[PDB]
Design a protein around this ligand. Structure first.
Ligand SMILES: [Zn+2]
Length: 362
DNA sequence: CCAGTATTACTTTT
DNA sequence: AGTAATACTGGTAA
């Protein structure tokens, strides 16, 4: 008995005829802008203002990222094309060369290092609207409005700028509007109220928040394409902190890691994964989907759940709950978890030959 | 030319 | 409020 049996997915969002279809994808995660805005303030940030972000239990890892961070998304898109239809709602799975790969809060935490513990009690009530009423008249608050105030505010004993800085940070990196311009969508109301309490903001599980936000963009994306990738130059926006999604395929799949990833010199070993690796420079601003598909090749070495190294065990003990949470009943995902739980790997070989045929031959 | 990014215009919902 | 079209960036390769 070589293990409990793992069932094929009920369905897939995309047929394998779409695996070669390239798309432009629009991020909404302005890591580079925020840092430039912060560094170019006419009245600079004080030590306490600076160290608030550079020693933040979650956001200090934003500073371990490479300078001028630019997102690379065809790994994420390759994953998206392989999203399985499942019952669970708090985790996503992608079937690559017939191997299911999980994107859950544990994986969002191992790559980003953000706090992914349970929300504090009655966390929505946190804050008040007093801080924002002191700077923003009645109406919509757009992201450009928060940035503008920050660059103009005068530094002073009230740490109100830091609150504006934090609000700018949250709504530009964690929970980010899609629409821009004169009619940009209003920024997340929770972040507006949460930014009034700097203590609360230093400890909140912003990873869970970022993660739950990513889950909505994933669902919206899959809803939008309805199984067909069009032929358009018009980019599709996927807002939120997508760095974990950008790296998942590379952490899971050694063939991609060997061609497109390099270790980051002098990184600390207790940091999450995004601090300790970097994308290789390529011919383009990001990898082409063809490059990903070609390097996938015929590889069978793929991790379903990406295993932590020993140096990463204290990290996860600190940023993840031991509270595996409650989700909808999933006979298929349960049968995967049961087989992986016993040390056995999963591989639907018809799906593997389909993937190989759709990329390498057709 | 390209993928990532920023911006403006047109469509759908309400 | 949502999506599509357009244009800009900083490269590479022809
Ligand atoms: Zn780090």
């Amino acid at each position: 008995f070589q293990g409990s049996h793992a069932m094929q997915p009920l369905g897939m969002y995309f047929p394998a005829s779409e695996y070669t279809k390239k798309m432009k994808l629009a991020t909404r995660c302005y890591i580079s802008e925020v840092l430039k805005t912060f560094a170019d303030l006419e009245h600079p940030l004080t030590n306490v203002e600076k160290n608030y972000f550079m020693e933040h239990p979650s956001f200090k890892h934003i500073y371990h990222l490479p300078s001028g961070y630019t997102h690379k998304l065809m790994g994420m898109w390759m994953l998206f094309l392989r999203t399985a239809s499942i019952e669970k709602k708090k985790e996503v799975w992608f079937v690559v060369n017939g191997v299911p790969i999980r994107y859950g809060i544990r994986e969002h935490a191992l790559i980003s290092g953000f706090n992914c513990k349970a929300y504090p009690a009655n966390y929505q009530s946190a804050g008040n609207m007093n801080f924002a009423n002191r700077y923003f008249k009645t109406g919509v608050i757009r992201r450009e409005d928060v940035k503008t105030k920050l660059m103009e505010m005068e530094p002073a004993r009230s740490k109100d700028r830091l609150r504006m800085a934090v609000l700018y940070f949250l709504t530009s990196i964690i929970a980010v509007p899609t629409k821009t311009g004169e009619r940009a969508s209003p920024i997340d109301d929770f972040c507006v109220r949460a930014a009034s309490d700097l203590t609360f903001c230093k400890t909140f599980p912003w990873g869970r928040y970022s993660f739950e936000y990513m889950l909505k963009s994933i669902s919206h994306t899959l809803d939008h394409f309805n199984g067909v990738v069009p032929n358009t130059q018009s980019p599709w926006p996927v807002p939120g902190f997508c760095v974990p999604l950008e790296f998942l395929a590379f952490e899971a799949i050694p063939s991609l890691r060997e061609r497109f990833i390099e270790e980051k010199e002098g990184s600390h070993a207790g940091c999450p994964r995004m601090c300790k690796v970097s994308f290789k420079r390529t011919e383009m601003k990001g990898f082409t989907l063809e490059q990903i598909n070609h390097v996938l090749g015929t590889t069978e070495v793929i991790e379903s759940i990406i295993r932590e190294k020993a140096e990463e065990v204290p990290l996860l003990a600190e940023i993840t709950g031991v509270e595996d949470d409650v989700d909808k009943h999933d006979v298929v995902v349960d049968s995967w978890m049961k087989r992986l739980g016993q040390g056995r790997e999963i591989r639907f070989e018809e799906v593997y030959n389909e993937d190989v045929h759709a990329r390498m031959e057709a």
